[PDB]
Write a protein that binds this ligand. Sequence first.
Ligand code: HEM
Ligand code: HEM
Lengths: 379, 98, 65, 54, 237, 56, 52, 74
Amino acid sequence: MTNIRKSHPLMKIINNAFIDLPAPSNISSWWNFGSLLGICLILQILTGLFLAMHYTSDTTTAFSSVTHICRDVNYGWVIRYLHANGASMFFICLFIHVGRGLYYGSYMFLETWNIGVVLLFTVMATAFMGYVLPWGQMSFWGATVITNLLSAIPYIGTDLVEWIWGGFSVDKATLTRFFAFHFILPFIITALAAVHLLFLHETGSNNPTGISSDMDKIPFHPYYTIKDILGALFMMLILLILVLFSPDLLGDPDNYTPANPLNTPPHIKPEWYFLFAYAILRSIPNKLGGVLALVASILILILMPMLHTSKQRSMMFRPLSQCLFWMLVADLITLTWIGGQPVEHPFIIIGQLASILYFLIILVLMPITSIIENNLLKW
Amino acid sequence: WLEGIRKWYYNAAGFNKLGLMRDDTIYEDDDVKEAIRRLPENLYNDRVFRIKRALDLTMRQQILPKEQWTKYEEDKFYLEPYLKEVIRERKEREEWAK
Amino acid sequence: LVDPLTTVREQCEQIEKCIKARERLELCDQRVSSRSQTEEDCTEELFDFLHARDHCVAHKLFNSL
Amino acid sequence: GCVPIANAGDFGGYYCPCHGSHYDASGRIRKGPAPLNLEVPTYEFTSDDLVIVG
Amino acid sequence: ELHAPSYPWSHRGLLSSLDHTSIRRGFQVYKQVCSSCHSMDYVAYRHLVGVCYTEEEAKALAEEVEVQDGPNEDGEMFMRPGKLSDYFPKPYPNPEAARAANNGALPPDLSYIVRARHGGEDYVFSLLTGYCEPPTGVSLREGLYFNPYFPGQAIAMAPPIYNEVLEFDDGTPATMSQVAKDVCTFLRWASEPEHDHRKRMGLKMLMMMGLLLPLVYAMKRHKWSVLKSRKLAYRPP
Amino acid sequence: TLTARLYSLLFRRTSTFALTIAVGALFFERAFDQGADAIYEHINQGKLWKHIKHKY
Amino acid sequence: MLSRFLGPRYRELARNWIPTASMWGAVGAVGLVWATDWRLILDWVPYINGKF
Amino acid sequence: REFGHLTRMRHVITYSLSPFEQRAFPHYFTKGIPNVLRRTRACILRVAPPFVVFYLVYTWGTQEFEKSKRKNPA
Ligand code: HEM
Ligand code: HEM
């Protein structure tokens, strides 16, 4: 006789995944966000399904269908705002997870780090694409701007924007193809998340100290289930606070207007989780260089495993690196704020300077600070 | 002179509070795990006890009391000779490969 | 039928923010009227005069309704 | 938005009556509420008798 | 630009709700003031019942208007009295007709007008009570009107509401400020019908969050009690 | 010690534990719904279509 | 890394693998031109420019 | 990578207690608050200044933009 928990194949996989998987005891709350992301994935996908059950992707019905969901459908407004604020919370958790990975040297798990970068790319694409679906003024106009950014690509680039648009500009074909891709992509995210978990489970998670915790490992089920339950409950507390008291808080009011291609909005801006890289795009004058900087602003995460030079993996014992990391976080907040604001004086200079400081901190200040760090500790 | 800055940094680092020597904090790459395997029994046992105690402390978020902190002058670089030997052997192998 | 808004607005006229705003507005009025062709439009100090007045009003008016 | 009526707008060319924005006859705007000039498409002048707009 | 103030709306409280009597009065304002030029097609007389009118009142209100719909046996579009199924009547048949009728400008759909303008009701109210005389040095083309709150400082809408512009069914004075308040709160209800429910949605959850959080956390600490009290000893030979 | 007898009579068995949860869910939903709703119209008395329908 | 790849036998490996990798590059270029039907290149080649 | 052969350790003695015999919140406020102040003091000097400079630059940018929108007496 043998345990069904660790002899049945599905149950054996689940057991080795999150029942009897050894875990560091000193894991802080910063790791809970990982599970939160998974929760914020499922809570998204399910809701999306219900939205897809009352959404008719067409330039003559998209806004009307969304309105019909909001008003007429029994408890449809709650699903819609749940979806929007859940995407926002998903990006909050994603950014916090990336910050944790940077802080505690979690990028030493190279395969997991690269798979996470791919997941992050896919999530940005999914959210950008999904924001088109309500077909508001902001949706259509922002989509036009972002897709037209691909015209800067040399040679083929112009043809590409005709290919993505499904024609001469963003129209019904673009809307329906965006709907289809928005449907398919989250399942690719789920598969990539499974692969990301496999890679991490091969080596095990990293404690805040950075030292290997093989000597002190605790089973996952008795402890790190209820802790993740508490984390998910707190995330739900925040998310339903947003949905039930300030539904259209982060979303721009201009979306609640039929997409009229005869009137440019006063300011065309993406989501708050998109304004930082869009501000980076704004900063560079050259169009092609702008797109290169925009893509590099996220692709630079892959370079992080190579740029690490300090002998300590984590940052608990590197105060100078901690100050640099917080300078980077403040710089990202400045990028978001600048992206919100129009490209005028002095926002132009502030955005440019913060854009340079972003790459300068990531590529230069952190490694040089790490060299000084090693020199300061006899090694 | 620089040793004052070094002592200030050691105080501001944090692993002295957790009762960790310097070599307990180094990232475990291939050279480092090989050196750890190369350690003698007594040093390895003290190292693993120190690391386990530190992980306990940061799990509870209680820094170890003031008086028995690892002093600057009492910090011994036990891993350093073994790590230097490992690095030298690896460098010699790479030179032979070239 | 007099309005609550007009009397609340009149009472909100006599506070020092709106006093300085009205003086600045009158100075721009005489400046622009005196000069034959000038793009200087007294819109902006008018906007500050508003911004004082409507805030003062909004603090009180809803109780009168 | 809206549509500028032609043969109006002091300068002579165009006039948008929604919020009274007069336009330069050449296609630009001399001044008015409208921020920038009227958009010009990628038209082609081949065979003037039969002119195609892209 | 000059943005709106922060008027203390009765529904602006964290767990407050709109005054439904004022909803009904604002809807009367919408019917007898701006329903001749503005459309609120996204809402129907069905939404009216249960929040501002009863079933019989809604039925009478619906039959008071005439809606042309359906092809008859001969195929002609016949007009019939409106019913609860019908949405709000559209004053103009097609948008181009509306623009050509007024000045070329298009009266925006009042269904989502409050949720679309930065400032909400405080904006629209400020506009309605903000009809001013153009300042010195600003010319006015005959047909436009000056409103500081409107972006562009020139609105293409004549002053809609003023004193005694209507006669409320209840009997409250029809003064301009009261009319503006009622119509603005009605437009807030129309833009976000779930508002009241959302507030009732939140309160329970809040009390629920006052009960699950201290429990689950405690349970977590209970399950952590083994580790947090764990004591170690080193006994080398 | 009320908790001791409560545990010994209705908490030791997981089956009776689940019965306690399922049965108490009925009355907790009952009482919580009523209390929260009462608080809600207490804060918003006279502004709902429940305290003014008698007028119309 | 930098120095560990900078050796005599490493440049020997590079010289050995230059032909195969270089003409793998030609394989890829020809495949790209083929798949995309690149008229800029395919026009010059004979018997295929007739397809245009 | 599973329980049974994770690593090697000797001469380590560890004790703990049942969750049903010890308090779940042992003086949650007696040492919890001093611990919070200690950690806050440890991290404040390295956390705050990057955020305070952001606060200053945000305020300066907003005020300068407002001033630029004002007319410049011409
Ligand atoms: C990866 C998780 C997902 C993210 C981040 C995401 C993101 C978004 C966003 C930001 C919107 C626009 C919300 C708004 O209108 O303001 C949206 C709309 C939509 N999404 Fe998703 N989505 C996700 C998963 C899904 C899934 C799995 C489906 C299909 C089952 C789906 C279907 C829809 C539909 C139909 C809409 C249009 C309705 C609406 O806009 O409210 N979504 N999505
Ligand atoms: C689709 C969203 C994602 C999901 C569902 C996900 C899932 C998880 C989970 C559950 C963990 C374990 C808990 C934790 O360590 O936080 C984890 C760890 C990790 N993830 Fe992710 N992740 C996501 C996105 C990312 C991103 C964007 C990155 C960065 C590029 C990333 C890199 C990592 C790293 C480095 C770890 C290890 C952290 C450690 O061991 O301390 N993940 N991931």
